[PDB]
């Protein structure tokens, strides 16, 4: 009529979470309604997407990084320091590489990232091919052979006391030429739009994602490890355009990564993420 | 619409570990990522191994123990005290048998182990066949019949106040000869390399692994139990070599065990493992 329990003793380590940072498992949580089975639809007519939230959809999304003005005084085989602080060079890699300083002193840092860079700041290591859209803005007259060449590894740069930037002297047509360097010689007669696709190659499998974060004179290390190399534009010919029109043109370089992948979320940033909140007044602090 | 629970009560003894020293089971641990399923590859191109970490791969790895110099003054049927402190005898068995004393007094002990010995110091009991590579270094002139014989059990030894070593008097060609003892008479004309394979035989199934640890005048006991016996070289003939060349040769004896097995990890060493860290200065203590 009523037996005993021919069972064993079930060990138990009181541990509520056993997973609160990982992305699958019985949550032991509670929903505030009758049925825990309140599961919604497959996003039909909910908003216009195929799939939005696919890194290939965001790292496959393009974003400008910096414009470069090329006047017909800039000399052959010398990069373009006009239009940005990066001399015309562009450290290839998903992590960010640009930052300025906002002051009262306080001297906080500020960035200018793209999605391809907006993600990696959320993780630790990375691996991905990149895709740079190079668009020249000009007429059918502004003509000139423009060379784009890759160089793997660290860069001749200037380790500023608070910020970081390049070195233009080490890039002349003699020091680091582009014959023994992957090359592309874009003509500007009529073929302008370009989309360079750089696979990922480096001695180490992945790469950090601090880039220029906490970078300055001394602590430039992770930066030198967080970028497989760099592209560097260098004119083959002085911009050929009559005074009838502008003696300078502009270049735009987008950015988006394909075949991307990442490893761990806890980023290597000295501190956590504190997105910049444009303050009340230009002087007001953060 | 909603029933009660026609279940029983599940006993529970709060015990977090229930296995932290054993090598299989649900760990109740936590991984620091999304998926607990982060399991890696089968070691393809990861490093050049077939399988490295197979005791038969390490106890099948050879290592010298001690070199023995044999001059043509050393007399027939008397072991060789020249080249080590073990008189030319070699206590067979996986555990270690050699140790010296480093001083300021303090008088700490120091070892000189091989893998076949490096493991057993990590466990308690042992059982294994051994394999000794005997290589004579000589010309085609140095000639002489060399006898290698086994003796099971304890040894006539000298119980020093702090260390331990053999006794050479009890091994002459009269006291313990090699006729009623397993034997091998190696010639040195042209056949030199040897690899003796000793199976494991003893009244007791396994054997401890302290060997010479904490061994001295009084506490030599486990040593006498941690070695099935010993080999003992004894020349049949005085080294035959003209003064035109060296009147002495050298012998090398490697070591590695086959068909090995062990029982329990907690070693019988008086104290835990404290590997020797070569100090800053020769005098500096540990």
């Amino acid at each position: 009529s009523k037996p005993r329990n021919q069972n064993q003793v079930m060990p138990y380590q009181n541990v509520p979470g056993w997973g609160y940072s990982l992305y699958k498992g019985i949550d032991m949580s509670v929903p505030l309604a009758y049925d825990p089975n309140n599961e919604l639809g497959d996003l039909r007519d909910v908003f216009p997407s195929a799939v939005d939230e696919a890194i290939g959809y965001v790292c496959g999304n393009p974003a400008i990084k910096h414009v470069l003005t090329w006047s017909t005084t800039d000399v052959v085989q010398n990069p373009i320091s006009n239009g940005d602080d990066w001399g015309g060079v562009i450290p290839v890699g998903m992590p960010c590489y640009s930052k300025t300083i906002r002051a009262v002193t306080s001297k906080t840092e500020v960035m200018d990232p793209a999605p391809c860079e907006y993600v990696a700041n959320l993780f630790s290591y990375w691996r991905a091919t990149m895709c740079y859209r190079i668009t020249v803005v000009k007429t059918a007259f502004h003509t000139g052979r423009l060379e784009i060449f890759f160089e793997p590894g660290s860069i001749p740069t200037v380790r500023t006391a608070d910020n970081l930037g390049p070195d233009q002297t080490q890039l002349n047509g003699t020091i680091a030429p582009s014959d023994n360097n992957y090359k592309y010689i874009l003509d500007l007669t009529n073929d302008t739009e370009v989309t360079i696709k750089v696979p990922y190659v480096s001695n180490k499998m992945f790469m950090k994602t601090v880039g220029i974060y906490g970078a300055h004179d001394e602590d430039n290390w992770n930066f030198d490890e967080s970028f497989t190399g760099f592209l560097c534009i260098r004119p083959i010919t002085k911009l050929m355009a009559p005074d009838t029109v502008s003696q300078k043109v502009s270049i735009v370089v987008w950015k988006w990564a394909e075949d991307v992948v990442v490893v761990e979320p806890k980023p290597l940033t000295s501190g956590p993420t504190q997105v910049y909140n444009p303050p009340a007044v230009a002087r007001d602090l953060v | 619409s909603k029933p009660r629970n026609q279940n029983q009560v599940m006993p529970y003894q709060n015990v977090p570990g229930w296995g932290y020293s054993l090598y299989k089971g649900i760990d109740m641990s936590v991984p620091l990522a999304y998926d607990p399923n982060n399991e890696l590859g089968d070691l393809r191109d990861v490093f050049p191994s077939a399988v490295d970490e197979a005791i038969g791969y390490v106890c099948g790895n050879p290592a010298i123990k001690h070199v023995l110099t044999w001059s043509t003054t050393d007399v027939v049927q008397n072991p060789i005290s020249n080249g080590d402190d073990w008189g030319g005898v070699i206590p067979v068995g996986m555990p270690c048998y050699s140790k010296t004393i480093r001083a300021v007094t303090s008088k700490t002990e120091v070892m000189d182990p091989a893998p076949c010995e490096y493991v057993a110091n990590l466990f308690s009991y042992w059982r294994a066949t051994m394999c000794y590579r005997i290589t004579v270094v000589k010309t085609a002139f140095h000639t002489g019949r060399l006898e290698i014989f086994f003796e099971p059990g304890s040894i006539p030894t000298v119980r020093t106040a702090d260390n331990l070593g053999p006794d050479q008097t009890q091994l002459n060609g009269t006291i313990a000869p090699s006729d009623n003892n397993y034997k091998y008479i190696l010639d040195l004309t042209n056949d030199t390399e040897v690899t003796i394979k000793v199976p494991y035989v003893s009244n007791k199934m396994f054997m401890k692994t302290v060997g010479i640890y904490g061994a001295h005048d009084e506490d030599n006991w486990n040593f006498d139990e941690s070695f099935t016996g010993f080999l003992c070289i004894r020349p049949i003939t005085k080294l035959m070599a003209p003064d035109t060349v060296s009147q002495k040769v050298s012998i090398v004896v490697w070591k590695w065990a086959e068909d090995v097995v062990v029982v329990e990890p907690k070693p019988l060493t008086s104290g835990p493992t404290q590997v020797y860290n070569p100090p800053a200065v020769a005098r500096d203590l540990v």
């Binding site: 049925d35 089975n37 309140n38 599961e39 | 619409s1 909603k2 029933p3």
Partner: peptide, 17 residues
């Protein structure tokens, strides 16, 4: 579609069991 599978089969839950 789960609850939409039970509401269509008129299972004995929705009615209060």
């Amino acid at each position: 579609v789960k609850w939409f599978a039970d509401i269509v089969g008129g299972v004995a839950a929705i009615f209060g069991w």
